[PDB]
Amino acid sequence: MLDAERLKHLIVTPSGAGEQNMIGMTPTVIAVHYLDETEQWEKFGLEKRQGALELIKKGYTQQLAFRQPSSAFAAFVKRAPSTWLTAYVVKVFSLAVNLIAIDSQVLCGAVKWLILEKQKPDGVFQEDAPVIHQEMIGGLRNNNEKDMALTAFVLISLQEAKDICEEQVNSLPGSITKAGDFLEANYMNLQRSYTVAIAGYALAQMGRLKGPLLNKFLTTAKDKNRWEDPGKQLYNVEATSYALLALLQLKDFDFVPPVVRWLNEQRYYGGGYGSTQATFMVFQALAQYQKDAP
């Protein structure tokens, strides 16, 4: 458990356009999430929760200014819509709906655009207008094995939004399955540790991480405590958080302790330029761990 006192900095006020606003929104949202699940508001000061919430509301409200009529998002209202950003908004809002009042139409409208506009017949999601801030997308920035990584990222977002939107968006279950199909058919050709981690969580969420696939995911971990690749270390923090969440999905409680320890050993507390994915992902997984204590 990362000590509450080391997180005071994740409480930021969001500003900027369609991408930067989400960059500021992220830390505050995941921080309130982690503190709620670890029950550290006493050690942190309960009176601070309400203020964080107001910051989150503010992030949500100014994000709506970049909502296009199609229900998609971009850095600016007349920039071509980003598949990635729209899914990322879905990922955050789908968590944030539990903290503050979020309009279902905004969230599920983003979900329907993704599904009806951006998914290919074989289930892969395509980015047609990459985000400007390539530092907010974590290990996806490494542009190779992109179909599988983008498809995984979006799929996870969709799974996150499922219970919230299945009612307004009938095509959701089928979209999820078709993306699941694509990840499954190609999961064995994956080379990067990053992708095996994120696609592995995506498949694990469905229960399609099994047999050879399960084995391959489990046997990509170096020292059986982390998933990593050469390059920017934030990517490895991020990927290993995905694996933690995947393993947690498999109820493989006998594998998580090392991974949880290596993560705690990183002494990483999120925040700063380029930290968006690692911050959201590190605190979501450990939150998941703390609520999954058997």
Binding site: Q105, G109, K112, I115, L116, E117, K118, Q119, K120, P121, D122, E167, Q168, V169, N170, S171, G174
Partner: protein
């Protein structure tokens, strides 16, 4: 009229709601590369909804399948090709292969998720 019917690979262009009757009209759109068949608009009258459109399937062409037929795409976009319903696709026999007797053309048309793959035999 209650909620509009669901269609495969498509959805209404508007935020659904549980009370319609009557005179109300809802519109559908299909997913990317799917082809809407029927009237885009459905209407409410007498309590029932008028028949919704349906989404004709595209075809996705893969080297994986093409290899069984000793065939390749003519304008070599992969490996993988998405073709909409109605669009034709042009193959070639792979090096060292000929059209084969029971096959009539190397160009075939996609219909609602069905595409004929020409066979090539080998000289």
């Amino acid at each position: 009229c209650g909620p509009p019917p669901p269609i495969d690979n498509g959805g209404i262009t508007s935020f659904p709601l549980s009370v319609y009757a009557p005179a109300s009209s809802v519109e559908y759109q299909c997913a990317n590369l799917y082809q809407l068949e029927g009237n885009k608009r459905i209407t409410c009258r007498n309590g029932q909804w008028s028949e919704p459109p349906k989404c004709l399937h595209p075809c996705v062409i893969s080297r994986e399948i093409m290899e069984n037929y000793n065939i390749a795409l003519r304008w070599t976009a992969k490996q993988k090709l998405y073709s909409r319903t109605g669009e034709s696709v042009e193959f070639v026999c792979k090096r060292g292969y000929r059209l084969s007797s029971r096959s009539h053309t190397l160009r075939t048309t996609c219909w609602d998720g069905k595409l004929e793959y020409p066979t090539c035999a080998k000289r």
